[PDB]
Design a protein around this nucleic acid. Structure first.
Ligand code: ZN
Lengths: 81, 23, 232, 687, 62, 717, 225
RNA sequence: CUCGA
């Protein structure tokens, strides 16, 4: 019911506020998952017990914050308050 | 004309009042 | 001059008769130069056919209401103006539309003479009242662009004939905008976006190809002067 | 900055200083205009910062008596009759009489036309009074304004606020490569340029014996010769280019006191603080939105607003504890390619183009062995480079600087040059940059109408007139009727009439609007120069009449209407604009606020030794200050992590900032912030 | 006393702070800003700060 | 989006660029990768574009008055050396383009980028947190561009003509695309009134009911409209399904639409719709013919006649001063009222003489910018100017800036102009000082609980009922009633409740109580919130910026302090009055109060004033002593007559203001209680900001007063 | 109301200005055609200009030459007015040696085979008895406007002084249309294009270059997908 | 010290 979100407005901030309780809680969900994806890309060539890789298909040279923000949008993560 | 004392370009003034004392 | 290569044309198909075209990338700032020219060429220089004047039986000096139908006069003229049609004869062609009895009139209930083609037979025209009858004569001509009804005053005979606005152009609505695209390091190069919504007489592809042909011929008049150089 | 800024500075009246008052000890009463300031201190020209009212400019005709008070001339009125006898009165002497306004209707013999005339009285009272009561009257209308203020045409149509900015920004004009005198002037530009002292006036009459770009020789009538040397491409105090050019040619008779050569911001002896630009008053696609400016790229292609700037770079070779710093081309671990622009001494050669980071003077300083990092000593062992006990301390080009090296000056203790004790050599390198007008450079007119450059369209995108000539500058219409500076609109109208010329209908007598105009104004050739003196000059009746008889172009067509508007074509689409637009010529100045200087950015860099926080200022390669109010904004957003990141690892965390830089180049994640070193200092000070 | 000494009357606050021997519980916006802790507001409160994110058990083949 | 220079982004992202230069093997090691960025090798510009991709940055313009003084943007590499800022965020930054500079800050950690992407992004902050009304809306050129095409012109070409004679109805188009083709050829004007068959715009809810009603209008269904081609093009900008608006787009009309879009439609729709309004406004502002010329500055026709009539009255008052019949102090006041009435007559002579096609009138009357007072000064007369004393000069500036002031007229004008700029530097210092005092007093006020469950609240005057029976909307609904939450069910004359307890008072939910006859509501307030330290979200209400209930953890105290201190730049009461209230000073007015309800005993004289009150129940007479220089407030006596000047025999209530002025808030506490003194401080502060054109919700004022009454003194240990 | 193919006929005003009438065109089509030609004329017409100069006694712009009245900066500004064409389409050098007294004009330049100066009367510098001016002038061929190429980007050494290059040979372009709005079956627009050049090329040669530019360009819409 | 918003 809206034009295609371009750039940093995707995913739409409205839908992201549904899997989460508040604006502030979405920040921690995305940031901690972004650190997991970044640790996967840095521990992919060495070691085990590496963090879970990108749950969704990542785009080329996509920032871990963006991947994490789509995994949150696709209902692929949990939480613990 | 405006300021016809040193040899400047002829700038024409919309002057209605005369200048009694120069700067 | 100097070579300016790699300008391409892509098409995104929104609907069957509405597409978006992108010409990318163009030298700064050629998108603006040809943006308004492509639009005006589409909207005003493609041959098409449309209704020039109509005449309704029973409507002589009133033009307020038609007895036997719910729609008044101007509402009949509107949905008749949106009737899409194509003809192979350049001279004007007269068609007749007649249907009696309670029911509904469509553009399929029209009888088209040989050479003309009605492309929207399912278009509603009029609702016929109980024991209702509607006779109307349509005049179809070829032309280009949009000509007001006032100039069709001579086409109607002095006997209850009313002239209508002629939407000759097969395309309906065209808009354009220019954005920026960096090929190498500079971001000055232009990206032109054309949005053309056309009737079902022709697709947006052929409408653009027709505008290109007529433009190459137009600027060809200037090219024929000397045939000098310029980078491609 | 420009000759006018220097002239105004020598005529400043400052209340601050010893024996005066402190800035903290100056209420709103010392700063505002006093009725005794009439004809003595200007009520317009004053800064708008914290020094408002504390710094004034002396009025034009004002002078100082040996007592210390300021005298201003007046015309002595005998018995209601204006006399050419002029006497200077002090402040209290003026209060003991009553004076008539300068623009009083006066008979050719001297008697006032009206019995009651506007007269100024003691304690700032303005009222009508009998003609037999007027004791004195003002010399000139502009008697109360300053030199810079007297340079604003149609000043009587501009409010005091924008007039203050108009005069203050004229002193900020940048001397351009070539100078154009304004079409619409006031008459003050000539005396302002000559009395400034940045032109070359002939002392004695004579003929020009030899003229060169270097000097001018004058052969006097008695037989003696005086030769004036031109100041060429000299750096001013503020980095502008002070460059004098000869005007006269070989064998030209020149009278005494005549301008034989003019310098920066001068054209034929008049102050040329800007250029005459073809202006259109219309909004244009939001690029000129609220005070932004749209410019034609012609001003870039034709160097209309190009200015020369010169920077001074300096470095010295001292005596250190472990030897002496030496200026040499031999610099450790530097290729022959960076040192390619240096001569055999280690100095950049004249004419070389130097970007930022390039070496200007190669200086090495000896560093002790006991001052080496463990890694640096290992790195020295794994490269076998012995005898490199010196480090690099060369003079490099700062960030944002680039230009041609135009001059070098070397001072050596070895060569009898007296340097401060402990210095062996001193080198100064002058770099000149040619700055074209750029997006973001600040332009302004004479009526306080300022704005930065938001967009420089190609010459074909510009709205062009009927004959194809595109406009040069587009000014948003919304920012005109708020500021109450209609003078820019009236200047635009008169400016066009000056560009095109006019011819008043002489048949059937002189028309009723041009009855007050001098006979020299009834006809004008294109590109004519005119004067609108302050509080005198062109009236709107005569201006409206001139627009009606503007001269046609070369094709014989009149482009602007009697209303002053003209029909423009959209250069982007081709369709003509639906309504006529005001078009004319306005004098635009390039102010000394250029993005080439005001841009700055920093990843890391120097830190203050005591507080371990990043340095300040662009010249020190410092960072921006996230102040107290900015922290309230982060807290209002709830951006806790962004706020902690700003105040710790990005500022004064000694170990956190290094581990953040490593984590970025490693691709790792950002580590956890530590304890600010500034908080450690606070505790050690409470102790 | 640390939030007060940075507002107004620094010496008047530090004198009474040392006489009364006051101890400052470092739990406030102004205090955490000075020492470098996360402010107890917004994304800094313990409700949002200590949160564990884990993917749902569904995963791709590789 | 924002545009930063390439040379700024390279240094800002320098370590990130070095990392990528060494990954793509443009550089051997990280050491040489640094030398490449310092030397600006051509490979870095291709690498830099990959780096800044979707990495937000922070833009800041000092002074940072409110939290929107710093916003997050998506950087876009642009040539040149200037920062490119969006035209809609100019209002928040208070940033014109006359030499302003902004600071850029790059968030590094994942949490900081997430805080910029979600909390601080410019698109997620369209509404003002202080008032809830939009900020990123058409403001200058944009409102003029929209106001242009949404104008009905009676004589415009292509206008609809009724069927008469042999020709039928002229000016009825089958499709808006046809109307565009008509406007292209030159037959139809964009502002001409016509009849168009629309098929992709929902009709107004008025006419949608009679055409369909049973089912909503569907994209594809047709209907006729009597608008202009421009008004149709304007309605295409707002999202599909929005009710067609056939109005003329003033700034107030556009603000109302965007406010309604923010309440009902989601965030991303509002951000994209206002981008469409921006592009459309700038397009038509270019072609709206808005221009300033000397010809468009029309002078009053009766200019000489009006001034000669008041010069006559001024000469008669001057002759009435020559015979000594008028005091010198009274002559000035007499001439002031003569020239104040003169400037009003010249101003009226300009409104009627100026057409509405004139661009100077179109700018002011479309809400673009400027007053008519400025227009009057431009074309009519400056009027009475002030000397550095303060009172108006007995001689006005008769000339207009179009005419050209005289030497003495200009000189006397500069007196008020310079002191106008001078005190502005001092008034901003006291403003910022008050602001930082409010910041420190409420810095730790956080929303820590969802609902404290206290049924306590306060009564809000929703509306007032006229004697005839009509209910008049209260002026304080915006700042005191909207965005509240209920603490008591609203009951009308019937037993049915219109709105439940704990429901956010939206825009239609206020009209529900308005049309129900009830004129008073009991709403949850942050004053009555019984929480240990912070405040609960239910008592706070709707976050004015978020448009929903405030989230737990939002530092509403700092937001409140910024909301009050941001407009403190413009005051005259005045700014010292605001400091008299927040510092709990014994005010200058020092108005008395009724300590006990009863009967008034007015014992007035001329040497002094003394008033007693007989207690309505027991007690003894309470004697006061007041100076005769004050005057009694017209107290709403029990007679229901509000203009009842307090004479003896009136029935005043406890804690009733006696004489005019400002009652001592210290004494208001020890009379009516903490609950009432808080309400006094709230709407007393609110009267100062309302009397200046600033709308601050009472919510923020209440957050400060809650901190003033958190402490009590000890009487007995 | 049917098609008649449009015609373009030339009218000469001076040696470097010509009007071009194009009719018949559809109503509302004349303004857009004149613009698309004007925009292509003012920007993308090939021409030649001087890239860099080299004066013997100088090493940079900011200095003087003994005996000449103008500094090197003013001499370069006067050389920005030079109009020149070149057949080589490759860098080629012009020379200028003049001993004072007298005035150095554009005619005093000796152009190599292929290039030619089109205003031999342009003032360049004034020389006295002690004046001597020896200048080399590199002339390349391009289009539009290119700023002075840096010495760091080029291989040019210290002596060379780069100059801005204004390659466009057209001077001023405008247009007007005459609409036939007589309410009848026949409405048409007549475009009158006005082109002024700078004696480097004739006005019809410029319009021909803009013709081949737009014929090539608009041919992108004719190719199918 | 001076200036810019
Ligand atoms: Zn509560």
């Amino acid at each position: 019911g809206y034009d295609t979100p371009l750039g940093i407005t995707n995913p739409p901030i409205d839908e992201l506020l549904d899997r989460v309780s508040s604006k502030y809680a979405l920040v921690i969900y995305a940031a901690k998952r972004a650190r997991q994806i970044n640790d996967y890309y840095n521990q992919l060539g060495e070691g085990i017990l590496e963090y879970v890789g990108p749950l969704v298909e990542p785009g080329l040279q996509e920032k871990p914050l963006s991947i994490a923000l789509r995994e949150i949008h696709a209902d692929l993560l949990e939480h613990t308050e | 004309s405006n300021n016809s004392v040193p040899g400047a370009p002829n700038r024409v003034s919309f002057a209605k009042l005369r200048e009694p004392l120069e700067v | 001059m100097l070579i300016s290569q790699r300008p391409t044309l892509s098409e995104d198909v929104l609907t069957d008769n509405r597409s978006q075209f992108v010409i990318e990338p163009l030298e700064p700032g050629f998108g603006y130069t040809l943006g308004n020219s492509l639009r005006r060429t589409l909207l005003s220089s493609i041959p098409g056919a449309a209704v020039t004047s109509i005449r309704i039986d029973g409507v002589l000096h009133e033009f307020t209401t038609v007895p036997g139908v719910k729609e008044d006069v101007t509402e009949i003229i509107l949905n008749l103006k949106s009737l899409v049609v194509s003809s192979e004869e350049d001279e004007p062609v007269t068609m007749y539309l007649r249907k009696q009895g309670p029911g509904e009139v469509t553009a399929g209930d029209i009888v088209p003479p040989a050479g003309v083609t009605v492309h929207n037979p399912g278009m509603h025209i009029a609702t016929l009242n109980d024991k209702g009858k509607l006779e109307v004569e349509l005049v179809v001509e070829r032309g280009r662009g949009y000509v007001p009804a006032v100039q069709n005053r001579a086409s109607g005979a002095e006997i209850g004939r009313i002239p209508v606005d002629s939407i000759y152009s097969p395309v309906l609505k065209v808009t354009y905008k220019v954005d920026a695209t960096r090929v190498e390091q500079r971001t000055d190069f232009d990206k032109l976006i054309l949005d053309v919504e056309t009737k079902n007489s022709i697709s947006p592809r052929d409408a653009l190809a027709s505008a290109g042909k007529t433009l190459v011929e137009l600027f060809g008049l200037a090219r024929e002067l000397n045939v000098e150089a310029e980078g491609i | 900055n420009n000759p006018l800024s220097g002239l105004t500075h020598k005529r400043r009246l400052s209340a601050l200083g010893p024996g005066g008052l402190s800035r903290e000890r100056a209420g709103l009463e010392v700063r505002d205009v006093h009725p005794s300031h009439y004809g003595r201190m200007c009520p317009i020209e004053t800064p708008e910062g914290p020094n408002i009212g504390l710094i004034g400019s002396l009025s034009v005709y004002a002078r100082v008596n040996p007592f210390g008070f300021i005298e201003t001339p007046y015309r002595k009125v005998v018995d209601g009759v204006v006399s050419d006898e002029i006497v200077y009165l002090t402040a209290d002497e003026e209060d003991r009489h009553v004076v008539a306004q300068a623009n009083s209707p006066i008979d050719a013999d001297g008697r006032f036309v009206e019995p009651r005339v506007l007269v100024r009285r003691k304690a700032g009272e303005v009222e009508y009074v009998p003609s037999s009561e007027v004791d004195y009257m003002d010399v000139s209308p502009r008697q109360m304004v300053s030199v810079a203020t007297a340079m604003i045409p149609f000043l009587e149509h501009d409010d005091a606020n924008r007039a203050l900015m108009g005069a203050n920004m004229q002193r900020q004009a940048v001397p351009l490569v070539r100078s154009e005198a304004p079409l619409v002037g006031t008459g003050m530009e000539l005396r302002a340029a000559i009395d400034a002292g940045d032109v070359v006036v002939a002392e004695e009459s004579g003929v020009i014996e030899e003229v060169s770009a270097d000097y001018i020789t004058v052969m006097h009538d008695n037989g003696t010769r005086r030769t004036y040397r031109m100041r060429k491409f000299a750096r001013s105090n503020h980095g502008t280019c002070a460059n004098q050019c000869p005007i006269v040619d070989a064998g030209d008779r020149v009278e005494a006191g005549q301008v034989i050569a003019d310098g920066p911001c001068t054209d034929d002896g008049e102050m040329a603080l800007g250029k005459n630009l073809l202006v259109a008053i219309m909004p244009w696609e939001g690029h000129n939105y609220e005070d932004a400016i749209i410019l034609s790229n012609r001003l870039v292609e034709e160097d209309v607003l190009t200015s020369i700037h010169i920077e001074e770079h300096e470095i010295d070779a001292r005596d250190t504890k472990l030897g002496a710093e030496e200026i040499t081309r031999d610099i450790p671990n530097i290729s022959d390619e960076v040192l390619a622009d240096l001569d055999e001494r280690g100095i950049v050669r004249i004419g070389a183009e130097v970007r930022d980071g390039d070496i200007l003077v190669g200086k090495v300083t000896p560093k002790g062995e006991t001052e080496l990092t463990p890694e640096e000593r290992l790195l020295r062992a794994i490269f076998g480079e012995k005898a490199r006990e010196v480090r690099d301390t060369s003079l490099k080009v700062p960030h944002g600087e680039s230009g041609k090296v135009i001059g070098i000056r070397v001072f050596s203790r070895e060569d009898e040059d007296e340097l401060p004790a402990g210095v062996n050599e001193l080198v100064r390198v002058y770099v000149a940059q040619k700055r074209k007008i750029s997006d973001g450079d600040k332009l302004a007119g004479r009526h306080g109408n300022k704005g930065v450059i938001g967009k420089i369209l190609p010459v074909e995108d510009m709205p062009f007139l009927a004959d194809g000539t595109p406009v040069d500058i587009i000014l948003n219409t919304h920012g005109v009727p708020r500021r109450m500076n209609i003078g820019q609109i009236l200047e635009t109208h008169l400016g066009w009439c000056a560009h095109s010329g006019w011819k008043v209908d002489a048949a059937k007598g002189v028309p009723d609007w041009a009855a007050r105009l001098p006979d020299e104004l009834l006809e004008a050739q294109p590109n004519a120069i005119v004067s609108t003196p302050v509080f005198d000059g062109a009236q709107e009746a005569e201006l409206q009449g001139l627009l009606s008889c503007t001269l046609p172009n070369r094709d014989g067509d009149v482009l602007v209407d009697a209303d002053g508007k003209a029909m423009l074509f959209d250069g982007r689409s081709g369709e003509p604009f639906p309504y006529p637009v005001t078009v004319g010529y306005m004098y635009i100045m390039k102010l000394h606020h250029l993005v080439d200087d005001k841009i700055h950015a920093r990843s890391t860099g120097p830190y203050s030794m005591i507080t371990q926080q990043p340095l300040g200022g662009k010249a020190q390669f410092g960072g921006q200050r996230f102040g107290e109010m900015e922290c309230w904004a982060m807290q209002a957003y709830g951006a806790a992590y962004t706020l902690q990141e700003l105040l710790t690892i990005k500022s004064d965390d000694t170990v956190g900032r290094v581990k953040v830089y490593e984590a970025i180049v490693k691709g790792e994640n950002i580590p956890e912030p530590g304890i600010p070193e500034s908080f450690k200092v606070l505790l050690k000070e409470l102790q | 006393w640390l939030s007060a000494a940075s507002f107004q009357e620094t010496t008047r606050v530090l004198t009474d702070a040392a006489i009364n021997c006051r101890s400052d519980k470092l739990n406030g916006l102004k205090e955490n800003v000075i020492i470098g802790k996360l402010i107890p507001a917004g994304t800094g409160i313990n409700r949002y700060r200590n949160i564990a994110v884990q993917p749902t058990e569904e995963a791709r083949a590789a | 989006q924002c545009g930063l220079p390439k040379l700024m982004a390279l240094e800002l992202f320098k370590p990130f660029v070095m990392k990528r230069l060494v990954d793509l093997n443009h550089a051997q090691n990280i050491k040489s990768a640094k030398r490449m960025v310092e030397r600006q090798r051509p490979q870095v510009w291709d690498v830099l574009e990959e780096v800044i991709a979707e990495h937000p940055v922070l833009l800041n313009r000092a002074p940072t008055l409110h939290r929107l003084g710093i916003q997050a943007f998506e950087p876009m590499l642009v040539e040149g050396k200037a920062i490119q800022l969006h035209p809609l965020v100019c209002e928040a930054f208070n940033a014109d383009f006359d030499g302003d500079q902004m600071a850029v800050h790059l968030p590094l950690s994942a949490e900081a980028q997430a805080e910029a992407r979600i909390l601080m992004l410019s698109s997620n902050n369209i509404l003002s947190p202080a008032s809830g009304r939009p900020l990123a809306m058409p403001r200058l050129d944009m409102v003029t561009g929209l106001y242009y095409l949404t104008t009905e012109v009676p004589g415009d070409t292509g206008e609809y003509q009724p069927a008469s004679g042999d020709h039928p109805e002229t000016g009825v188009y089958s499709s808006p695309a046809e109307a565009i083709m008509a406007a292209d050829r030159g037959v139809l004007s964009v502002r001409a009134k016509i009849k168009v068959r629309l098929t992709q715009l929902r009709p107004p809810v008025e006419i949608e009911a009679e055409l369909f009603g049973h089912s909503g209008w569907q994209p594809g269904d047709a209907w006729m409209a009597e608008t202009t081609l421009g008004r149709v093009m304007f309605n295409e900008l707002l999202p599909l399904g929005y009710p067609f608006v056939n109005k003329q787009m003033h700034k107030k009309v556009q603000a109302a639409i965007i406010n309604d879009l923010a309440e009902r439609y989601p965030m991303i729709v509002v951000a994209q719709t206002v981008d469409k309004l921006k592009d459309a406004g700038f397009y038509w502002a270019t072609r709206s013919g808005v221009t300033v010329s000397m010809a468009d500055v029309l002078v009053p026709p009766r200019k000489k006649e009006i001034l000669d009539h008041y010069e006559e009255r001024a000469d008669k008052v001057e002759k009435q001063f020559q015979r000594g019949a008028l005091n010198h102090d009274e002559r000035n006041e007499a001439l002031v009222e003569i020239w104040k009435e003169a400037t009003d007559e010249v101003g009226q002579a300009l409104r009627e003489h100026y057409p509405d096609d004139n661009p100077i009138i179109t700018i002011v009357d479309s809400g673009a910018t400027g007053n008519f007072t400025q227009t009057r000064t431009l074309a009519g007369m400056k009027g009475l100017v002030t000397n550095p004393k303060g009172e108006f000069i007995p001689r006005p500036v008769k000339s207009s800036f179009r005419e050209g002031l005289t030497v003495l007229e200009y000189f006397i004008n500069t007196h008020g102009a310079r002191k106008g700029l001078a005190d502005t530097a001092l008034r901003t210092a006291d403003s910022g000082y008050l602001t930082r005092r409010l910041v420190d007093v409420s810095q730790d006020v956080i929303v820590r609980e969802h609902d404290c469950q206290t049924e306590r609240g306060i009564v809000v005057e929703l509306a007032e009922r006229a004697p005839d029976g009509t209910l008049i909307r209260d002026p304080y609904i915006e700042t005191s009633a909207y965005a509240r939450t209920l603490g008591t069910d609203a009951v009308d004359e019937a037993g049915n409740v219109i709105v439940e307890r704990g429901q956010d008072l939206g825009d239609p939910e206020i009209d529900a109580l308005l049309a129900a006859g009830i004129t008073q509501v009991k709403v949850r307030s942050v004053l009555t919130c019984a929480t240990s330290t912070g405040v609960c979200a239910t008592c706070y209400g709707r976050s004015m910026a978020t448009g929903k209930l405030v989230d737990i953890g939002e530092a509403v105290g700092i937001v409140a302090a910024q909301s009050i201190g941001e407009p403190g730049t413009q005051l005259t009461g005045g700014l010292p009055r605001v400091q008299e209230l927040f510092e709990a000073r014994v005010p200058r007015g020092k108005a008395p109060i009724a300590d006990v309800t009863g009967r008034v005993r007015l014992e007035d004289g001329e040497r002094f004033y003394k008033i007693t009150i007989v207690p309505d129940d027991g007690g003894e007479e309470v004697v006061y002593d007041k100076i005769s220089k004050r005057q009694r407030l017209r107290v709403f006596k029990h007679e229901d007559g509000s203009e009842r000047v307090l004479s003896d025999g009136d029935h005043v209530e406890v804690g009733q203001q006696l004489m005019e002025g400002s009652a001592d808030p210290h004494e208001v506490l020890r009379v009516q209680g903490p609950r009432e003194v808080q309400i006094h401080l709230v709407r007393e502060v609110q009267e100062v900001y309302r009397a200046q054109g600033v709308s601050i919700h009472d919510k923020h004022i209440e957050v400060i007063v809650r901190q003033m009454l958190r402490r009590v003194t000890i009487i007995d240990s």
